[PDB]
Amino acid sequence: EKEEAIFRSAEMALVQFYIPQEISRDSAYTLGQLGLVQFRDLNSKVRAFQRTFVNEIRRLDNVERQYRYFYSLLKKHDIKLYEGDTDKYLDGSGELYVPPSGSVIDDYVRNASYLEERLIQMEDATDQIEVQKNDLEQYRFILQSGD
Amino acid sequence: SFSHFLYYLVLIVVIVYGLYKLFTGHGSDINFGKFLLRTSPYMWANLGIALCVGLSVVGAAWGIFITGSSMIGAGVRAPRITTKNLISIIFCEVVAIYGLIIAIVFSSKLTVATAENMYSKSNLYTGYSLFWAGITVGASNLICGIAVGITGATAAISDAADSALFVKILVIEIFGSILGLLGLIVGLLMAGKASEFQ
Amino acid sequence: TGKAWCCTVLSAFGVVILSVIAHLFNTNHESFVGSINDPEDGPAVAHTVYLAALVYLVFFVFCGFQVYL
Amino acid sequence: MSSFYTVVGVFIVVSAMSVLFWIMAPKNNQAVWRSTVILTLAMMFLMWAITFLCQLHPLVAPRRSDLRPEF
Amino acid sequence: MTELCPVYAPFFGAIGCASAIIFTSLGAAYGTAKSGVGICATCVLRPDLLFKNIVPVIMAGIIAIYGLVVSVLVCYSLGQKQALYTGFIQLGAGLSVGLSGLAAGFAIGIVGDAGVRGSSQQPRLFVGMILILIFAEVLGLYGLIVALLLNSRATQDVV
Amino acid sequence: HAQLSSVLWTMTIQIAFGFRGFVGVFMTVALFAMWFALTCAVLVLMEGT
Amino acid sequence: ELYAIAKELDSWFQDVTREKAIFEILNKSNYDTNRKILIAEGWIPRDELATLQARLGEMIARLGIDVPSIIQVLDTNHTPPTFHRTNKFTAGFQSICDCYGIAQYREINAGLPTIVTFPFMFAIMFGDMGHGFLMTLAALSLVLNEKKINKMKRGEIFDMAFTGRYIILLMGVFSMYTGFLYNDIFSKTMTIFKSGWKWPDHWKKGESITATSVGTYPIGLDWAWHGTENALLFSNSYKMKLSILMGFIHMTYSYFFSLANHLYFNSMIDIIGNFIPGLLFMQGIFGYLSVCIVYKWAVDWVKDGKPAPGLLNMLINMFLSPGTIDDELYPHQAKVQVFLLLMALV
Structure with a gap:
């Protein structure tokens, strides 16, 4: 039975996870699904760029930058983002859900990059056409002015 | 400056009037003693209570703004x-509560005196005491608040710079916050022997 | 519907309140007609406040019907 | 005919019921139940007792010059 | 004109009825003006905060309410043959509420401007501003209260 | 809070009791509307906050 | 292209932010190069510890791999995090207290006492059955419709109001109680009980009449002094004394909470040199003032033929002029006051 922690703070225990590397990516996902472990920074003396999982975080940052560009485009053109997945992961229940596979994340990265290039070139072409249209419309207005 | 010109003109007018009264043998006509004796002690007491509360609040x-x-x-x-x-803002608002307190205590002495016992020794003394005690409390609380606020601004900026700094600047505030307290005490000592108007 | 909700709330609060005030006036409550500065006649103020409460009741019923639809 | 002993008796009753609730507080959220109920009782009683004691032997009586003579 | 009730006694009370509104309306205007300047500067970027950065302009108006209360209470104690003590009390009650409200408004303004300007960046600061603003507002309250107490004596046991 | 409440009562709804007839009824309705608006706004939210 | 992206952009974002989040967490771990294991130190509630293990076991059961002990409790002198288990009722007050600061580990939580004391101190400051009832109804609108309001989106001000819906409910209820004790409903008074004051049998219009005490009002302020000239003088005295007593009681409760903290942490030096001295200092002065207030209330001075001592002037002389009592509140008052001043000065 969980103790009531309103009169005083809940009793806390420090716990070491000796997480095998081959399942580490999965273990974290469970530790994040429980939502009960507050991890200590054991590499607090290690510089941000000198940390062990810096490259994966950089890849995910690039993917999130591409997604933030996609959202910016979805807002420039009046296109509504399709919200969802609120109940997909059952957040807060403490129950585990099969995490995305590494191949799935690699596919996400590759698709994000490919869509980045495609959307960049499409936006460039559209912007060129739009500026040409604006110039022609201004010229037409100038011509249409009364004598 | 218009304000400085007005001050100089007022000073010159006062000097000329005083010299005219003095030379013409009527120097005593400018009788501050008669003014104090004949001005109602009610005015002095009420001005003291209002200025106490108002200046403490000011x-x-x-x-609080600083x-x-x-x-x-x-x-x-x-x-x-x-x-x-936010403790800094409580050292600034506590002087006001001192003034308020004094007002309450001094307002207890705002009784109604009889017509004959109006400008007596006790009533004039009570008027002067409650005027000057209110002035002292109000001005001391004014100074303490403005000074504690200036220390609290420094403390807030230091705390933003580094947390450990705050406790060291708060001490200065504790030094300043006492200055109103002293005024409070002194006010209670001034109006201590003052009595309700009778 | 926000205007209807506000009006019906303000109308129930005022039907109840003015009905109570009118009842107190009619019963010549000391807190309402006990002072020389208070209105001389109790039942007449009670009647006027009752009419005001009836106006507020009409407002309440109308706005509640509007909220319903 | 009420005196300070009325306050004492009300205090006795309030303390008895507070102890009773502490003994019989629900197990679930027991700390919240005990603290909330007992503190609410204590402060409600304290405010009532303060209001009652000021009226026990008041040093000033109601004085007004606006009542109608009919009352 | 009696010894205790000169013809000029109503001068002080009428100046107190005026002082209460004039100086609690000076402070409220200062606060409203500065808070509105801050709100107009911020809501250009953050209109969604507008109907929630109005709080300082609501507190400054409450200062004006404190001196409309002391003014209306002091105006109904004003009389042609009211004692000089009553007049001094009514002047003190308006000097207190009016000056305290001026100070409270001047502070509400300066602090609301700062807090609306900073809240457009740090929303968590809104709680800080409202707390610093409730202590600037209480100053005015403390004046009103003193004023109220003054009026509780203005006309009583007075011959 | 007590003094502002009493003052609001005197300014807003106490006057309504002074007038009778259709004028009195309309004054009661409007003055109670104003009294409740100021009570919920000033004396419940503002003073309450 | 944008519509194709939009139908799946949120899922991609949620999935990548979680993967970036798991890789930041692993970044806090010490990767043993010689071995192939990450050392991750985490704070978890002890009661939850078993659950953690179970879930990890489930993961193993899903993976099918055999691994050594993946959970090892550790005993280190590291400041543990402060965790308070709240609910829809205590969450608001816990947030109220946490905004000031986070309680020390296993320190007396200020939310549990604030659940009641924050609403009741507000109610003292509010004291009106009308306004209290309006606020109670406003809070009940949120509480009864709490599910619907939780489901929808809320603005910052509305979100704050809804989160503190139970706060406001308690504030309204206690405001109703206090206004009943103040006999204040929309600035008016109730006449439920027989008043303890009797106005003169007969008087003329405009005649200053004073009432005589025939009893004590059972609950709340007597309605006899409603609209009376001196009503404000009694209300001010009563409410000043009430505020002083309530604040002193609320500070004493907090100081005894400090004592409980000292006892729990086995800081006997704090009890001897921090709690007892400050307790004596605060008692001898302001608890003595509170006791004097109550005693003066409980003493019939007019009947006893003794002047009613001024407690404010008593307290002032207790410091500025020790041993000089204008009016003797109780026998041996001067000696007791001198002893208390000496106790504080020591």
Whole structure:
């Protein structure tokens, strides 16, 4: 039975996870699904760029930058983002859900990059056409002015 | 400056009037003693109580704006200070509560005197005592609030810079916050032997 | 519907309140007609406040019907 | 005919019921139940007792010059 | 004109009825003006905060309410043959509420401007501003209260 | 809070009791509307906050 | 292209932010190069510890791999995090207290006492059955419709109001109680009980009449002094004394909470040199003032033929002029006051 922690703070225990590397990516996902472990920074003396999982975080940052560009485009053109997945992961229940596979994340990265290039070139072409249209419309207005 | 010109003109007019009265043998006509004796002690007492509360409030408000404006600026990047430096704003608002308290205590002496016992030794003394005690409490609380607010702004900026700094600047506030207390005490000593108007 | 909700709330608060005030006036409550500065006649103020409460009741019923639809 | 002993008796009753609730507080959220109920009782009683004691032997009586003579 | 009730006694009370509104309306205007300047500067970027950065302009108006209360209470104690003590009390009650409200408004303004300007960046600061603003507002309250107490003596046991 | 409440009562709804007839009824309705608006706004939210 | 992206952009974002989040967490771990294991130190509630293990076991059961002990409790002198288990009722007050600061580990939580004391101190400051009832109804609108309001989106001000819906409910209820004790409903008074004051049998219009005490009002302020000239003088005295007593009681409760903290942490030096001295200092002065207030209330001075001592002037002389009592509140008052002053000065 969980103790009531309103009169005083809940009793806390420090716990070491000796997480095998081959399942580490999965273990974290469970530790994040429980939502009960507050991890200590054991590499607090290690510089941000000198940390062990810096490259994966950089890849995910690039993917999130591409997604933030996609959202910016979805807002420039009046296109509504399709919200969802609120109940997909059952957040807060403490129950585990099969995490995305590494191949799935690699596919996400590759698709994000490919869509980045495609959307960049499409936006460039559209912007060129739009500026040409604006110039022609201004010229037409100038011509249409009364004598 | 228009204000300085007005001050100089008032001073010159006062000097000329005083010299005219003095030379013409009527120097005693400018009788501050008669003014004090004949001015109602009620006016002195009520001015003291109003100025006490008002000046204590003015210093509290003046400090609250100095501390409050520097907490808000420093909390944009360090909002953690907002609640920590709020003790500064309590040292600024406490002087006002002192003034209020004094007003309450001094207002107890705002009784109605009889017509014959109006400008007596006790009633004139009570008027002077409650005027000057209110002036002292109000001005001391004004100074203490404005000074504690200036220290609280410095403390808020220091806390935003480094948390450990705050406890060291708060001490200065504790040094300043006492200055109103002293005034409070002195006020209670002034109006201590004063009695209700009778 | 926000206007209807506000009006019906303000109308129930005022039907109840003015009905109570009118009852107190009619019963010549000391807190309402006990002072020389208070209105001389109790039942007449009670009648006027009752009419005001009836107006507020009409407002309440109308706005509640509007909220319903 | 009420005196300070009325306050004492009300205090006795309030303390008895507070102890009773502490003994019989629900197990679930027991700390919240005990603290909330007992503190609410204590402060309600304290405010009532303060209001009652000021009226026990008041040093000033109601004085007004606006009542109608009919009352 | 009696010894205790000169013809000029109503001068002080009428100046107190005026002082209460004039100086609690000076402070409220200062606060409203500065808070509105801050709100107009911020809501250009953050209109969604507008109907929630109005709080300082609501507190400054409450200062004006404190002196409309002391003014209306002091105006109904004003009389042609009211004692000089009553006049001095009514002047003191308006000097207190009016000056305290001026101080409270001047502070509400300066602090609301700062807090609206900073809240457009740090929303958590809104709680800080409202707390620093409730202590600037209480100053005015403390004046009103003193004023109220003054009026509780203005006309009583007075011959 | 007590003094502002009493003052609001005197300014807003106490006057309504002074007038009778259709004028009195309309004054009661409007003055109670104003009294409740100021009570919920000033004396419940503002003073309450 | 944008519509194709939009139908799946949120899922991609949620999935990548979680993967970036798991890789930041692993970044806090010490990767043993010689071995192939990450050392991750985490704070978890002890009661939850078993659950953690179970879930990890489930993961193993899903993976099918055999691994050594993946959970090892550790005993280190590291400041543990402060965790308070709240609910829809205590969450608001816990947030109220946490805004000031986070309680020390296993320190007396200020939310549990604030659940009641924050609403009741507000109610003292509010004291009106009308306004209290309006606020109670406003809070009940949120509480009864709490599910619907939780489901929808809320603005910052509305979100704050809804989160503190139970706060406001308690504030309204206690405001109703206090206004009943103040006999204040929309600035008016109730006449439920027989008043303890009797106005003169007969008087003329405009005649200053004073009432005589025939009893004590059972609950709340007597309605006899409603609209009376001196009503404000009694209300001010009563409410000043009430505020002083309530604040002193609320500070004493907090100081005894400090004592409980000292006892829990086995800081006997704090009890001897921090709690007891400050307790004596605060008692001898302001608890003595509170006791004097109550005693003066409980003493019939007019009947006893003794002047009613001024407690404010008593307290002032207790410091500025020790041993000089204008009016003797109780026998041996001067000696007791001198002893208390000496106790504080020591």
